[PDB]
PDB file of C-alpha atoms and ligand atoms in Angstrom:
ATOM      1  CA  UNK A   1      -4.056   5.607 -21.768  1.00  0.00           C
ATOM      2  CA  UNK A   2      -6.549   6.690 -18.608  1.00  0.00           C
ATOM      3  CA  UNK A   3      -8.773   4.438 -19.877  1.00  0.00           C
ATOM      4  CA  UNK A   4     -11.816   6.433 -18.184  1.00  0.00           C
ATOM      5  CA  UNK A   5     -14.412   3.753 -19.093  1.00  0.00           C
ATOM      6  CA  UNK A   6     -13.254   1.265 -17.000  1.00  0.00           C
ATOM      7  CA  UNK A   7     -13.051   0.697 -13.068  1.00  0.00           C
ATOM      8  CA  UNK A   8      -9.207   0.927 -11.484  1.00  0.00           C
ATOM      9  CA  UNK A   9      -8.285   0.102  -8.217  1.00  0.00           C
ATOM     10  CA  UNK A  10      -6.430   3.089  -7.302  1.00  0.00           C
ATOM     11  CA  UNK A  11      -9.511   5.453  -8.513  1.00  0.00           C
ATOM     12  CA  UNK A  12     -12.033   3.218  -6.409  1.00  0.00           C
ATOM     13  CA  UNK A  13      -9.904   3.575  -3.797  1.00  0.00           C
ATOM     14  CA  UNK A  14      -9.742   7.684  -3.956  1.00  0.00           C
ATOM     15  CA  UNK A  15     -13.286   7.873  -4.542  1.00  0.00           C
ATOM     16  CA  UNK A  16     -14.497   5.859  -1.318  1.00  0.00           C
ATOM     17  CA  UNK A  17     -11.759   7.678   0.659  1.00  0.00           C
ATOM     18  CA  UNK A  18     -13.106  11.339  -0.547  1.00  0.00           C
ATOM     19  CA  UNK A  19     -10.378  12.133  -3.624  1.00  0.00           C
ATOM     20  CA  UNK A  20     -11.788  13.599  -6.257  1.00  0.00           C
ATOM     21  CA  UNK A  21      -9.476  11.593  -8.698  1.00  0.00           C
ATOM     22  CA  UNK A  22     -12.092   9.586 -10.370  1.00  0.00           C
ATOM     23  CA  UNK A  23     -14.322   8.717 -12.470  1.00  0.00           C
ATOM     24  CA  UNK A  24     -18.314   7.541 -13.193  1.00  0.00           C
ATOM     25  CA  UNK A  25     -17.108   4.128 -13.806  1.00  0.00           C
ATOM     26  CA  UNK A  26     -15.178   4.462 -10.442  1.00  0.00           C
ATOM     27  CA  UNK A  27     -17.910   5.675  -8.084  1.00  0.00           C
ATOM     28  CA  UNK A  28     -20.257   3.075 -10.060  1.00  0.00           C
ATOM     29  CA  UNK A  29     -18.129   0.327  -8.788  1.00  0.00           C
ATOM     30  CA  UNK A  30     -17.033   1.433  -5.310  1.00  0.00           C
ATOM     31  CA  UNK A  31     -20.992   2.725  -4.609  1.00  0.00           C
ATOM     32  CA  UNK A  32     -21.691  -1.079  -6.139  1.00  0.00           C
ATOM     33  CA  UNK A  33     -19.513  -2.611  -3.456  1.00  0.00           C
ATOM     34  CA  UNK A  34     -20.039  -0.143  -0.279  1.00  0.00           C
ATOM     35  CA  UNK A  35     -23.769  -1.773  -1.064  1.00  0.00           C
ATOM     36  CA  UNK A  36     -22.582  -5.499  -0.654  1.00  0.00           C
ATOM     37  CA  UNK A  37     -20.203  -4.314   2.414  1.00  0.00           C
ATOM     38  CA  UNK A  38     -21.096  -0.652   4.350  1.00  0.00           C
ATOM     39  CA  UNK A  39     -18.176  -0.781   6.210  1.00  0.00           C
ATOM     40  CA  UNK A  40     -15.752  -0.101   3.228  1.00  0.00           C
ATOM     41  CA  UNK A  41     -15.078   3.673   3.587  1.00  0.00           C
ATOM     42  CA  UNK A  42     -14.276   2.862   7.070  1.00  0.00           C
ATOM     43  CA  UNK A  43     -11.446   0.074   5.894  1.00  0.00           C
ATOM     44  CA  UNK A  44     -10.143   1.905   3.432  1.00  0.00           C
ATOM     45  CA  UNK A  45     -10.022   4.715   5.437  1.00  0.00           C
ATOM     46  CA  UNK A  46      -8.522   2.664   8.546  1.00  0.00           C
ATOM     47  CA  UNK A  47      -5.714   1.398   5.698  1.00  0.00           C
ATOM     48  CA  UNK A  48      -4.726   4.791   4.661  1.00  0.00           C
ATOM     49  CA  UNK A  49      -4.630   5.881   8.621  1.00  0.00           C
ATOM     50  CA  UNK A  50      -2.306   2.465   8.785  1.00  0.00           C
ATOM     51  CA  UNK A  51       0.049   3.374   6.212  1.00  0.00           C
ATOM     52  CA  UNK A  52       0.613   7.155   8.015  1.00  0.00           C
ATOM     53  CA  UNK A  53       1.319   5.446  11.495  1.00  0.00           C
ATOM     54  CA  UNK A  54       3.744   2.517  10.208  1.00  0.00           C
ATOM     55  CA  UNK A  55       5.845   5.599   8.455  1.00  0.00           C
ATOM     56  CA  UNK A  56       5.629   7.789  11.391  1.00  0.00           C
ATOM     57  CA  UNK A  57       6.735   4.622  12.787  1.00  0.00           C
ATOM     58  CA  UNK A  58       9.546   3.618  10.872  1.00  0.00           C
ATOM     59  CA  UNK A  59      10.507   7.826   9.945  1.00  0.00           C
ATOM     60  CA  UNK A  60      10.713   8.173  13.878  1.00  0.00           C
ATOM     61  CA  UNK A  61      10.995   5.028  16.164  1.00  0.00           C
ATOM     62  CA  UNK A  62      13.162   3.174  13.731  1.00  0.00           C
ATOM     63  CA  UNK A  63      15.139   6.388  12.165  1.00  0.00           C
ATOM     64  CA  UNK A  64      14.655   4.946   8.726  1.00  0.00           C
ATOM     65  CA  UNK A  65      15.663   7.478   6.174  1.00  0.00           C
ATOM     66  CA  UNK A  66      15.209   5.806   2.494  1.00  0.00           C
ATOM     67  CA  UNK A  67      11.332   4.415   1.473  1.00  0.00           C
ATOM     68  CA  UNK A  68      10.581   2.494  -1.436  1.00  0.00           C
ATOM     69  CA  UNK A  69       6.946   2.600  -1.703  1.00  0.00           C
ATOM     70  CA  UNK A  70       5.277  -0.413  -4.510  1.00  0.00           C
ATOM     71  CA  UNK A  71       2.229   0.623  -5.768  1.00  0.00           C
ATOM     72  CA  UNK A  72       1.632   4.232  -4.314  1.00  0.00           C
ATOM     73  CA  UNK A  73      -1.717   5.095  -5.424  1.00  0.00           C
ATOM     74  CA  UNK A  74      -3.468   8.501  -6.122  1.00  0.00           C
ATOM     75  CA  UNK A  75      -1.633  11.182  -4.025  1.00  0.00           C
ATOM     76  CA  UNK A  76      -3.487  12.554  -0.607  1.00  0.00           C
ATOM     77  CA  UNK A  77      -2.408  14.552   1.736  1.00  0.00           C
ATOM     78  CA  UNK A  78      -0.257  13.795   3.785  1.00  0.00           C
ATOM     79  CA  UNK A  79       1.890  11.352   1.403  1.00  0.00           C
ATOM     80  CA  UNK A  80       4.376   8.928   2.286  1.00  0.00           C
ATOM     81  CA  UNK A  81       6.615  11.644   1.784  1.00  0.00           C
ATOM     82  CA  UNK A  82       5.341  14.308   3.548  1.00  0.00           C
ATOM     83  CA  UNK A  83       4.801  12.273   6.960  1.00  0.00           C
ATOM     84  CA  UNK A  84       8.709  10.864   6.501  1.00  0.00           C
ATOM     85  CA  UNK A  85      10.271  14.214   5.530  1.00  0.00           C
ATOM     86  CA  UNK A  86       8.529  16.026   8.320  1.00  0.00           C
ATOM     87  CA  UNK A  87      10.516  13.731  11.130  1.00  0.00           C
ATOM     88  CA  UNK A  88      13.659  14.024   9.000  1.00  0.00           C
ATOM     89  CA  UNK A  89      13.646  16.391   5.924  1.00  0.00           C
ATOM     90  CA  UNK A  90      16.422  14.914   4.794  1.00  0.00           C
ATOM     91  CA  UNK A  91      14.175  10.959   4.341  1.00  0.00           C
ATOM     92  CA  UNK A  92      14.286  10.276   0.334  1.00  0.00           C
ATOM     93  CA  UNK A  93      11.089   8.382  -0.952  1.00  0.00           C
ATOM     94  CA  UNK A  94      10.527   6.393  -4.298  1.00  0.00           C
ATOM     95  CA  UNK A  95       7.426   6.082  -5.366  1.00  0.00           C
ATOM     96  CA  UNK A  96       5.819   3.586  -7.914  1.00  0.00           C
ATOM     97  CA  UNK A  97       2.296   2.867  -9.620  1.00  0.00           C
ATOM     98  CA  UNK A  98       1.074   1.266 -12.545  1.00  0.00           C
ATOM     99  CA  UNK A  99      -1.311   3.643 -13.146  1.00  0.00           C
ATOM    100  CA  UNK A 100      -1.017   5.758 -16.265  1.00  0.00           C
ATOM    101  CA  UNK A 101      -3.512   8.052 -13.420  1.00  0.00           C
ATOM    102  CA  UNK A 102      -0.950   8.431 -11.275  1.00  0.00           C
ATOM    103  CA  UNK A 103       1.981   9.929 -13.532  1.00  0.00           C
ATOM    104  CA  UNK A 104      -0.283  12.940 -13.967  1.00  0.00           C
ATOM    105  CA  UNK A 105      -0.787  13.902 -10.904  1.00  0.00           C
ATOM    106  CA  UNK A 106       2.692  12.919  -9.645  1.00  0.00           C
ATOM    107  CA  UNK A 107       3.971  16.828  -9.161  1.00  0.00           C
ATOM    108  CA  UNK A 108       2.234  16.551  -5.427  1.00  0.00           C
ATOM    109  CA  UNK A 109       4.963  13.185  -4.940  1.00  0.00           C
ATOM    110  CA  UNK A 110       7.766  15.024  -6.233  1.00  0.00           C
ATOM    111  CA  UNK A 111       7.225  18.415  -4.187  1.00  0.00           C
ATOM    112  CA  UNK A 112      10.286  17.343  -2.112  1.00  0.00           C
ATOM    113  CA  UNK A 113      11.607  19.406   1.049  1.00  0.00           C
ATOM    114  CA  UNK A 114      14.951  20.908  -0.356  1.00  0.00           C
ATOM    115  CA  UNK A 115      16.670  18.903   2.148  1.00  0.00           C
ATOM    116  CA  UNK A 116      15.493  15.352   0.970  1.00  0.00           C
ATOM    117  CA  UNK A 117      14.767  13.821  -2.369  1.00  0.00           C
ATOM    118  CA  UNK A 118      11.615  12.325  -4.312  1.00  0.00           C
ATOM    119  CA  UNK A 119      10.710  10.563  -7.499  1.00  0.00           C
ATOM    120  CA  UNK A 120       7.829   8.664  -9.374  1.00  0.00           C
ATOM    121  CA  UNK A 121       8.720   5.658 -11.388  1.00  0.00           C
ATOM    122  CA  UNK A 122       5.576   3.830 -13.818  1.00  0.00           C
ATOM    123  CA  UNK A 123       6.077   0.275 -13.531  1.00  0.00           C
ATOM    124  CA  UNK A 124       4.607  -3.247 -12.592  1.00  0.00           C
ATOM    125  CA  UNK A 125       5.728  -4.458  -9.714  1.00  0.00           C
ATOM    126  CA  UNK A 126       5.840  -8.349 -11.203  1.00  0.00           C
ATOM    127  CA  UNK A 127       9.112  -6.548 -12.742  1.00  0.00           C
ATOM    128  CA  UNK A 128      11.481  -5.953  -9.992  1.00  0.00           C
ATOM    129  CA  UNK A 129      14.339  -5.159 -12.174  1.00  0.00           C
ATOM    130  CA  UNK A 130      12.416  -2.294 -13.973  1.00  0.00           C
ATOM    131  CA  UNK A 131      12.064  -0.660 -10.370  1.00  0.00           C
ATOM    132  CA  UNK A 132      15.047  -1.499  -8.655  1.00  0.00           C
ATOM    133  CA  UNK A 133      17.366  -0.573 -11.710  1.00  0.00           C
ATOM    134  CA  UNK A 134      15.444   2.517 -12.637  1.00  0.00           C
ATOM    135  CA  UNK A 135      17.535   5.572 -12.916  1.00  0.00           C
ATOM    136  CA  UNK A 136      15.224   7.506 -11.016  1.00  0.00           C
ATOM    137  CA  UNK A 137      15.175   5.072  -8.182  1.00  0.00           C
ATOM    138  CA  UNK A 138      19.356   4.767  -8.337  1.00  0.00           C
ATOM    139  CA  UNK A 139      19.437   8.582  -8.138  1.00  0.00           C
ATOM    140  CA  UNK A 140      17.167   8.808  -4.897  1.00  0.00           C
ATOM    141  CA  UNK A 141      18.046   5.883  -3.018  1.00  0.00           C
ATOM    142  CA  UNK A 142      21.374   4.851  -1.916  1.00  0.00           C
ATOM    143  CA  UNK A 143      20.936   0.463  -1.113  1.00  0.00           C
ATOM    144  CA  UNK A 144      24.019   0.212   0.726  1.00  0.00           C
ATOM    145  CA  UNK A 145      22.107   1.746   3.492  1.00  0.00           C
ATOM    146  CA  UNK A 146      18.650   0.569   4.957  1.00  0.00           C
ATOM    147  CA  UNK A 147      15.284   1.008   3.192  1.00  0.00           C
ATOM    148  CA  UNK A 148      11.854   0.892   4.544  1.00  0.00           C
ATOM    149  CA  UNK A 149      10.003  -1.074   1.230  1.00  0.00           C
ATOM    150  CA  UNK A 150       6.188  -0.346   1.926  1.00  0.00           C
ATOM    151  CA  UNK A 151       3.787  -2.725  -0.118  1.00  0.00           C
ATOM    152  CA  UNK A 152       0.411  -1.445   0.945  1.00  0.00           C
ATOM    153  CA  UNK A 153      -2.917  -2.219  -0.045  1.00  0.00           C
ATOM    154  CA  UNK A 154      -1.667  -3.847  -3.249  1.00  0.00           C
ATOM    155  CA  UNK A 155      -0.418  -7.249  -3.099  1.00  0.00           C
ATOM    156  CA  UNK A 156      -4.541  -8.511  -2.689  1.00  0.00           C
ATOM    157  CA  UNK A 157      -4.053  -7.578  -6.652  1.00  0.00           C
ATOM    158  CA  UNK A 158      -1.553 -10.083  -7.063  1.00  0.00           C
ATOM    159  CA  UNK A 159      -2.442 -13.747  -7.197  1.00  0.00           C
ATOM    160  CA  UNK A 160      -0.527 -17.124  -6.518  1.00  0.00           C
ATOM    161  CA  UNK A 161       0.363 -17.818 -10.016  1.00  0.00           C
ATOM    162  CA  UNK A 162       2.634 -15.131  -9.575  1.00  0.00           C
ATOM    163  CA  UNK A 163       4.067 -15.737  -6.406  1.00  0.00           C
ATOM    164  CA  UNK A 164       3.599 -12.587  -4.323  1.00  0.00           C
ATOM    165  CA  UNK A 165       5.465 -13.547  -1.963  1.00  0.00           C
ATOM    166  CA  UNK A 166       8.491 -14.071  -4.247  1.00  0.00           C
ATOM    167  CA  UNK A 167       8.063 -10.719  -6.080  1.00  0.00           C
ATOM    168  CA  UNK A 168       7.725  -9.213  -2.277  1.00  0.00           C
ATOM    169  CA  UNK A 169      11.175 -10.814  -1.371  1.00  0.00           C
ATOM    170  CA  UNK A 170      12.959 -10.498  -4.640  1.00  0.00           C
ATOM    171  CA  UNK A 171      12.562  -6.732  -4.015  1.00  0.00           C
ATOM    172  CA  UNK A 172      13.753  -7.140  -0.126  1.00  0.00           C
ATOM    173  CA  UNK A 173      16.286  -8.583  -1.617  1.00  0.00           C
ATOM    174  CA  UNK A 174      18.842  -6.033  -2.693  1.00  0.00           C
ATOM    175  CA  UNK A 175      18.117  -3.666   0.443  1.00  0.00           C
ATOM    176  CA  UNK A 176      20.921  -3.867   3.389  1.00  0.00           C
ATOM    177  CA  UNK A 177      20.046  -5.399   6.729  1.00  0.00           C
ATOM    178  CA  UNK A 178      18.537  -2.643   9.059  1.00  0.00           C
ATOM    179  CA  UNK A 179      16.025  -2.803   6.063  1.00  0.00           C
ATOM    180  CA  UNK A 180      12.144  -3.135   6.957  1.00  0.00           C
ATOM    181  CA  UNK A 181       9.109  -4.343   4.837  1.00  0.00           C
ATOM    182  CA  UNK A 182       5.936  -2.996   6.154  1.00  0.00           C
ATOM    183  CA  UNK A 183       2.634  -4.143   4.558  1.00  0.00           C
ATOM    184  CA  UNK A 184      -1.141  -3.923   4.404  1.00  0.00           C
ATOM    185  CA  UNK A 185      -2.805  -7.137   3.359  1.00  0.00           C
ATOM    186  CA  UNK A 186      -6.427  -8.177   2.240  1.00  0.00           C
ATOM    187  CA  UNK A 187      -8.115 -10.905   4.491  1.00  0.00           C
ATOM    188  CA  UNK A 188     -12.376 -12.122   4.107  1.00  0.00           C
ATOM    189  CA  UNK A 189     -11.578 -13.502   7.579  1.00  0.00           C
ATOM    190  CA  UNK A 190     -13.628 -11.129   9.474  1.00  0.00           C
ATOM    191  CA  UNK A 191     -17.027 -10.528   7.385  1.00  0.00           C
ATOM    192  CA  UNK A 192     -16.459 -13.259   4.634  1.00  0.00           C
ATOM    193  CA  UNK A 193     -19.842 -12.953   3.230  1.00  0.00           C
ATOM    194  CA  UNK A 194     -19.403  -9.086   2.673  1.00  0.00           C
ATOM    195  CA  UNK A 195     -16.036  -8.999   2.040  1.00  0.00           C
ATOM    196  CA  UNK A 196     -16.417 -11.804  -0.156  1.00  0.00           C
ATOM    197  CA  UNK A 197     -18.770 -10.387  -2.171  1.00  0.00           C
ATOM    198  CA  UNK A 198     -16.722  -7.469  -3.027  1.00  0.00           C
ATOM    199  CA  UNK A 199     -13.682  -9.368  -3.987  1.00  0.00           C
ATOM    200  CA  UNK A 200     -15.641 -10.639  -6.862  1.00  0.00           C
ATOM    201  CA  UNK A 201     -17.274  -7.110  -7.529  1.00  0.00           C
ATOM    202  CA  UNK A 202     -13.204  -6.498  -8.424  1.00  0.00           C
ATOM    203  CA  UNK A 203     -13.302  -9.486 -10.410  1.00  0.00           C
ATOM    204  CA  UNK A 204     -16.294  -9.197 -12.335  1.00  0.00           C
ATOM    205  CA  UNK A 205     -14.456  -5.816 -13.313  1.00  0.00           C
ATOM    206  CA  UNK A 206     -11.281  -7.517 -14.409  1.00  0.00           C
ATOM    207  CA  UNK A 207      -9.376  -7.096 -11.485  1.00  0.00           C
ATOM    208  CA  UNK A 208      -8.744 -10.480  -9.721  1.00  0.00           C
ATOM    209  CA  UNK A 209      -8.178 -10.714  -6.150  1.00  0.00           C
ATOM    210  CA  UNK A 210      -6.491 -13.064  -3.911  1.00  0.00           C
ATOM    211  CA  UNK A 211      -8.002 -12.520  -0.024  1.00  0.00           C
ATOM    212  CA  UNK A 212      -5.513 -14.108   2.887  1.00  0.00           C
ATOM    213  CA  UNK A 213      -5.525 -15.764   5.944  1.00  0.00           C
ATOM    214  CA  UNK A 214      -3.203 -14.757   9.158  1.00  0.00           C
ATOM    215  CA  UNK A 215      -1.089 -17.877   8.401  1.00  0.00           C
ATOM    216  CA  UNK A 216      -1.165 -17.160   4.388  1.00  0.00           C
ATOM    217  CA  UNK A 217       0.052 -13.192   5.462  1.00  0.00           C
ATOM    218  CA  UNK A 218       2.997 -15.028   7.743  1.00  0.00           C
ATOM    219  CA  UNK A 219       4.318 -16.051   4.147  1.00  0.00           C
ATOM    220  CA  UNK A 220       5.680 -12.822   3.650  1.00  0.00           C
ATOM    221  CA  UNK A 221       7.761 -12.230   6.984  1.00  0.00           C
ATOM    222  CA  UNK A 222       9.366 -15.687   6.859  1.00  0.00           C
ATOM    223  CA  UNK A 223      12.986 -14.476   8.120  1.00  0.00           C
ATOM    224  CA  UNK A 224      12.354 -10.887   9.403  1.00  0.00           C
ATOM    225  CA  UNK A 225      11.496  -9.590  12.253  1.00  0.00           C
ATOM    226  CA  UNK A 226       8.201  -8.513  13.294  1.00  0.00           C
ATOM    227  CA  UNK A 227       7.525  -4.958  15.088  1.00  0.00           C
ATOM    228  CA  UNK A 228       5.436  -6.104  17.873  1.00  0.00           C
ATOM    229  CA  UNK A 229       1.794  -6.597  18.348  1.00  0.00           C
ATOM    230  CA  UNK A 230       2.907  -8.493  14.935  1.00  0.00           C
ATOM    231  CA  UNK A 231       0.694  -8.746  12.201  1.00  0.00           C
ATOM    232  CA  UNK A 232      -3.094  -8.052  12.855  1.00  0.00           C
ATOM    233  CA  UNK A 233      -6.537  -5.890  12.024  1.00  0.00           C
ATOM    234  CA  UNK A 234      -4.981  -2.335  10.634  1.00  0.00           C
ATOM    235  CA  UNK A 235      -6.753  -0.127  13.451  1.00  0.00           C
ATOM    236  CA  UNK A 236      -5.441  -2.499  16.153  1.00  0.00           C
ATOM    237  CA  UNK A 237      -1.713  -1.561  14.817  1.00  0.00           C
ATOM    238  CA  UNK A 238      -0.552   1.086  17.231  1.00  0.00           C
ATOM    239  CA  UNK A 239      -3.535   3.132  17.550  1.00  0.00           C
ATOM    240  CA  UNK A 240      -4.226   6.603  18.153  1.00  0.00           C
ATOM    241  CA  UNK A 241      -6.567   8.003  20.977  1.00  0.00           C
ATOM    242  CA  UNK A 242      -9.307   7.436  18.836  1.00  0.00           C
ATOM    243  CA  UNK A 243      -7.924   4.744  15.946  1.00  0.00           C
ATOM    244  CA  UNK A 244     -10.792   1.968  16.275  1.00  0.00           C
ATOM    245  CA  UNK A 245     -13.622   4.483  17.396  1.00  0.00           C
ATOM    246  CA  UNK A 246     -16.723   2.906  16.468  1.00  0.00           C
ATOM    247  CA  UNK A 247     -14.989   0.386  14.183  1.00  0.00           C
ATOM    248  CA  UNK A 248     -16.025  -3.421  14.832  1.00  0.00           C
ATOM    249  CA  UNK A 249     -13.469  -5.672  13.843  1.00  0.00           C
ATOM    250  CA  UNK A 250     -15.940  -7.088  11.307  1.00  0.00           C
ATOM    251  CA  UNK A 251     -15.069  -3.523   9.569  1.00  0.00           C
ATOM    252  CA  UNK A 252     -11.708  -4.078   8.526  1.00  0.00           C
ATOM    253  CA  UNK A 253     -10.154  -6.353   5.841  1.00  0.00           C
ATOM    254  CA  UNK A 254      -6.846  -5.713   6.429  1.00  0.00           C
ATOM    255  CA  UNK A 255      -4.102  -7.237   8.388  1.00  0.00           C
ATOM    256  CA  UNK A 256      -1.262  -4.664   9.280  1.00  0.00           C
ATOM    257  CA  UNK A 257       2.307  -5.687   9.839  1.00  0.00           C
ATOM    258  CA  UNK A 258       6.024  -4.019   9.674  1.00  0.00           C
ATOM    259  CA  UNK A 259       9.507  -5.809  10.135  1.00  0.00           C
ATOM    260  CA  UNK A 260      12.963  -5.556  10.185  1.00  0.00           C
ATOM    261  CA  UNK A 261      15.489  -7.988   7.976  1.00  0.00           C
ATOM    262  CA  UNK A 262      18.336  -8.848   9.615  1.00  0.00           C
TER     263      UNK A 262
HETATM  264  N1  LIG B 301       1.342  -4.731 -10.447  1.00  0.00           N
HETATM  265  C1  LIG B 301       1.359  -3.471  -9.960  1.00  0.00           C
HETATM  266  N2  LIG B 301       2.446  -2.669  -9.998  1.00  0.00           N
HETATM  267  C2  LIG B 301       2.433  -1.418  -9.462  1.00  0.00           C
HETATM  268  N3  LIG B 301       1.332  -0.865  -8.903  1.00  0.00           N
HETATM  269  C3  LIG B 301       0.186  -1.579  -8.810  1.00  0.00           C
HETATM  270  C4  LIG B 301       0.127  -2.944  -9.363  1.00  0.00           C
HETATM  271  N4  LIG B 301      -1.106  -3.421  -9.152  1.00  0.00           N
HETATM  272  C5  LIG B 301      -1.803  -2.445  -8.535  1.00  0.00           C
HETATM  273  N5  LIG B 301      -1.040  -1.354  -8.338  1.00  0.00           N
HETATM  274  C6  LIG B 301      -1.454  -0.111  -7.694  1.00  0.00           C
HETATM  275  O1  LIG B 301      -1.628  -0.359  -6.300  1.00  0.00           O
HETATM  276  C7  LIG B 301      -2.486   0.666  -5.794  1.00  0.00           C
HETATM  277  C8  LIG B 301      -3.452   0.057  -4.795  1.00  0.00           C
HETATM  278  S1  LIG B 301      -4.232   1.309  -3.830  1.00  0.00           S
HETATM  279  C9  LIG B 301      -3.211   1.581  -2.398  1.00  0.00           C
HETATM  280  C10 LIG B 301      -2.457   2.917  -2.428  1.00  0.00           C
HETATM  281  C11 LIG B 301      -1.523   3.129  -1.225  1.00  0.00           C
HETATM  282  N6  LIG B 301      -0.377   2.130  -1.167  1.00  0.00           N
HETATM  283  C12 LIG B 301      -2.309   3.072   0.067  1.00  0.00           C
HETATM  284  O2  LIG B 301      -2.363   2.030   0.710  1.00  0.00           O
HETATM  285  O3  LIG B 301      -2.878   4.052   0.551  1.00  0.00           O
HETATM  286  C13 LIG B 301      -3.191   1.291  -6.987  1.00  0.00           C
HETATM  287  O4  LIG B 301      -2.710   2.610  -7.147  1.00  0.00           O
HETATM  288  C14 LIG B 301      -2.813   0.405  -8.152  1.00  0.00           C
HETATM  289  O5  LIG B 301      -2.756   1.057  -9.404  1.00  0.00           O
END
């Protein structure tokens, strides 16, 4: 089920960021696209710097406590969980991939503090019920109280037909108010020729994308509220010291945003 002789996303993705969780038919496609667009180890990088701020974020300025996390990816250190149990070892984490890559490497997402409580559930995210009525999610989480649902780097996967912004809210849904929904998504706005270019590199290896504008991205907050500066370029999302050092905003495909449901 690895399925080694094909490109995957999350694989790619490892491989550009310095994982070693990949392989030749990974590199081949990510050193295929960092040819059409240099900048790509810098956004992807800049995206998995994103996703460790808006949980420090939510762990520490917003005291969430509960994280469902939709298409978590090859673990690196530090994980979702790691960054949330650190502010609050108690903070209880979900994760969920579709995969099969991910499964066997999952004993670095379920290496819980004692204190809180982790688990890895293989499913699609076009099946909400599969996820939100998984045992292992029912066991960990507790949706009477509020839940921080991260959706990062993923829903660029996930085209119109299927209404991503519908799946997105149908698993919103369920979660109290106090909830959140932070998310990282794909734009060609700023370098559309590049970026462009490797959007279809993923499609030519059957794995179709759908690219947004600012006012497509709005779709998905209809109704919540955004965490200021709002939804914009990743390394402009509370940055650190040295966030956007050297990094042109032509160098980053993804819009940032977090926000609270009432
Ligand atoms: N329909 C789906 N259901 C669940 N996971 C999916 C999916 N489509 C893609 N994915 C997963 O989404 C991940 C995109 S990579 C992003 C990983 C992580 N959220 C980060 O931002 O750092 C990959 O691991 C891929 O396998």
């Amino acid at each position: 089920r690895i399925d080694t002789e094909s490109a995957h996303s999350a694989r790619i993705y490892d491989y550009i960021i310095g994982g070693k969780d990949y392989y030749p038919a990974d590199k081949e496609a990510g050193d295929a696209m960092s040819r059409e667009w240099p900048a790509l180890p810098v956004h992807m990088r800049a995206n998995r710097d994103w996703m460790n701020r808006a949980v420090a974020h939510l762990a520490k300025e917003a005291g969430i406590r509960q994280f469902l996390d939709i298409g978590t990816g090859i673990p690196t250190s530090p994980n979702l969980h790691e960054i949330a149990q650190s502010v609050a070892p108690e903070s209880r984490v979900v994760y969920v991939d579709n995969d099969p890559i991910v499964l066997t490497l999952s004993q670095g997402l379920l290496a819980s503090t004692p204190e809180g409580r982790t688990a890895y559930v293989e499913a699609d995210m076009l099946d909400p019920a599969s996820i939100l009525d998984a045992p292992e999610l029912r066991d960990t989480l507790d949706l009477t109280r509020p839940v921080a649902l991260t959706v990062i780097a993923i829903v660029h996967f996930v085209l119109d037909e299927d209404d991503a912004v519908g799946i997105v809210r149908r698993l919103l849904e369920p979660l109290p108010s106090g909830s959140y929904l932070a998310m990282s998504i794909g734009t060609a706005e700023f370098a559309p020729q590049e970026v462009g270019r490797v959007a279809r590199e993923y499609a030519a290896r059957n794995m179709p994308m759908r690219l947004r504008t600012h006012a497509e991205a709005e779709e998905f907050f209809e109704g919540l509220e955004l965490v200021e500066p709002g939804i914009v370029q990743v390394h402009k999302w509370h940055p650190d010291a040295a966030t956007a050092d050297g990094i042109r905003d032509e160098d980053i495909a993804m819009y940032g945003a977090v926000a609270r449901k009432p």
